[PDB]
Design a protein around this nucleic acid. Structure first.
Lengths: 93, 80, 103, 97, 106, 81, 106, 94
DNA sequence: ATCGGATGTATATATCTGACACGTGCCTGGAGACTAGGGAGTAATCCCCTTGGCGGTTAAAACGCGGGGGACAGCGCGTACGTGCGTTTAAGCGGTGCTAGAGCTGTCTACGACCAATTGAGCGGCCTCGGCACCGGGATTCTCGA
């Protein structure tokens, strides 16, 4: 019929790690999808502006780090930047 | 056409809204005031909704148009 | 070997790279930007789903409904700032009564 | 015979409504109102079903929130009732007017 | 008929010098905070983030502008709250209510 | 550089409040106001310093403050915006 | 001979400049050939509409140089230019004279 | 030295046709320049967002019109769109 | 405070569906490999402008005090708001019908990116004088005590 992509299955895979026996309904999955979209758009927009300021064109893993430091609040920023640098380290090898 | 449909927002409805918000004793003149406030809010949102619809050459106000109209005003909405 | 598994993630690094490229953000998307961004998004959705499940458990249910996401977010103190302006549908209000009102 | 003291049913309703998540305004009169407010901007408007509800949901989270502030202003004047000069202050402080 | 033209000790009661300072400040447009104390305050606050920054001389000034245009505006709102409570003084419970309603505390 | 917030003295707060339009100050405002101003300054200089150390330099420019302001909803015209 | 693209439309603001900014600002993959013209027209209309009130103010104040205070007056005295610039702060613009009525003596 | 750009001379050419005898200051010129930049960014960003929802791949003279009609308040919108369409007509037929 | 009861709410068993969770094909978005090229990293260097220090001066801050206006507490009056009961009314729900208009696909072409040669608009550096800030001395208004 009509193909529309969403973050439902990944949200489900994460739920099955944080709580191995609970299950999201349909409305709550729609809400989590909208939340992921919103946060993605915030971080991407801030990284774009932050690259435009220093007169560059590559949006590399430094701009995303600085944008996470700007957007996310005090504590979430630390754990988010930690998870990010850990993942890029475990990916570049 | 329709006319004077704002009176459908009854007294018990505003009463229940206030009760959810935490109020305990509502004055008498409130109902008219909140009717005016709600009408203003709805006008401001539906204006942008209809603009977003017109731009796409459509005649049905989609749900994403209302979501975008609300987001453009710093009031996002999760679930549509 | 998908590029997400190579990082030890659950979010689709490929799809995030595609979105960053095709969203008109910058001229040349880097290499380790989608990995970082997918990791951040995964961390955040885990951090919110954990409290959502907790809230749904205390209410003796096994399904997470918007009431539980509302509770999980608004009860926290740093997610309530991130989602400071959103209105989760079917969410309701956090129960609270001003002390002056109750007898 | 028996009569709850004036004002004690207020808190019961407060706890009953703050705990649920239903929609407080009747759905059909609100559909009519939203459908006739948009008559000033176009005429052949159709208002897809899940749009109206969308609006309605937002249009509750506004009013409730507004009352959460109105009460404060009332409590500021050493009061209990929320008279219509509270809504105006609560809307002028946040820049809505 | 003639040609028309355009030209041809003490102690003020409390509350009058205030109504004069209001009129003489609401018409001026200079900065109302000393510059060296604000310099030092900005430099001292930026220690908690990075040790030794250099604060180009237009940065500091910039901040000062905003730091006025915030406080002033804040006071306006608090004023209303005071007038709302049927009084004339502005109290700390007014600033807190303004900041709460306005969204800065929640 | 310790305990400089006392540099926002009482007459400066009086003048700000006069320009704000208030008539009869209380006596406790002069500490609530310093607290508010310190919170605002921290919230702005944090993002200013982030913007200035992302660009690999050690001088807080005026564009950094303008950006850190515009990002919180409060723009500012006149300083190279 | 050449003929500036902003002179074929009766505009003063540059159209080639606006077009280069739209192209190299990463707003979209393609820029219509008449979008910069429309945008430059709107820009010069807004700047003329504000400069006119600024000059009116600077003249009704017996000066002959537009100055930030005059722009602040021209904006905050209007009703629609005030919503377009409800969040901005105009450096060195002061504030608008206003005193509540509960405060004025009786 | 490196040459940076602004809207100084164009704001001046507009001032010298709205008030043929007044003259702008320097700080007021910088304020008008940052104002023009800010409105430019607002309008172009909204136009982009709007030329994205509709999946178009270009930002045409109608995305700009709808952006101007969304961002600008009640009456400024009508005059702005009139000046815009007049300029675009006078430009296309030349 | 003490009961007595009367209303409301919370607890637990039965049952009943419909929405969530899982397995299936299958289509295209993601992964691998390789190349070319320009964007970013790195070394040199230069000069701007930030920091630091110092002396004078004088504007602004600090302190103390007298008292009058304002905040706050305490009472009576009365009205307008809540609670309960008996009415009306239209919301909601189910079921039918139907037609407008969203949505998707193929064909064609008008339009914007790209590239080359060029040339004049505007940008940086130089004067320079008129608008504006400053000062002084009138008139002119406003507040307050009598």
């Amino acid at each position: 019929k009509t193909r529309k992509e969403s973050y439902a299955i990944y949200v489900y895979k994460v739920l099955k790690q944080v709580h191995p026996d609970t299950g999201i309904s349909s409305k709550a999955m729609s809400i989590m999808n909208s939340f992921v979209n919103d946060v993605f758009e915030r971080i991407a927009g801030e990284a774009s502006r932050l690259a435009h300021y220093n007169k560059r064109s590559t949006i590399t893993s430094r701009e995303i780090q600085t944008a996470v430091r700007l957007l996310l609040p005090g504590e979430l920023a630390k754990h988010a930047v930690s998870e990010g640098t850990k993942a890029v380290t475990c990916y570049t090898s | 056409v329709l006319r004077d449909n704002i009176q459908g927002i009854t007294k018990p409805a505003i009463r229940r809204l206030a009760r959810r918000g935490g109020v305990k004793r509502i004055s008498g003149l409130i109902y008219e005031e909140t009717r005016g406030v709600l009408k203003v809010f709805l006008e401001n949102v539906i204006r942008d909704a209809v603009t977003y619809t017109e731009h796409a050459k459509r005649k049905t106000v989609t749900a994403m148009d209302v979501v975008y109209a609300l987001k453009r005003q710093g009031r996002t909405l999760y679930g549509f | 070997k998908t590029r997400s598994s190579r990082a030890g993630l659950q979010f689709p690094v490929g799809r995030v790279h595609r979105l960053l490229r095709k969203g008109n953000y910058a001229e040349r998307v880097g290499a380790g930007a989608p990995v970082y961004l997918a990791a951040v998004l995964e961390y955040l959705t885990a951090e919110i789903l954990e409290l959502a499940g907790n809230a749904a458990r205390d209410n003796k249910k096994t399904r997470i409904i918007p009431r539980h996401l509302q509770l999980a977010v608004r009860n926290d103190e740093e997610l309530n700032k991130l989602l400071g302006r959103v209105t989760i549908a079917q969410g309701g209000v956090l129960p609270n009564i001003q002390s002056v009102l109750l007898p | 015979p028996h009569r709850y003291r004036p004002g004690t049913v207020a808190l019961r309703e407060i706890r009953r409504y703050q705990k649920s998540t239903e929609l407080l305004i009747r759905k059909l009169p609100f559909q009519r109102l939203v459908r006739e407010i948009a008559q000033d901007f176009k005429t052949d408007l159709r208002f897809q079903s899940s749009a109206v509800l969308a609006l309605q949901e937002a249009s509750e989270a506004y009013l409730v929130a507004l009352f959460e502030d109105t009460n404060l202003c009332a409590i500021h004047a050493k009061r209990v009732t929320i008279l219509p000069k509270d809504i105006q202050l609560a809307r002028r402080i946040r820049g809505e007017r």
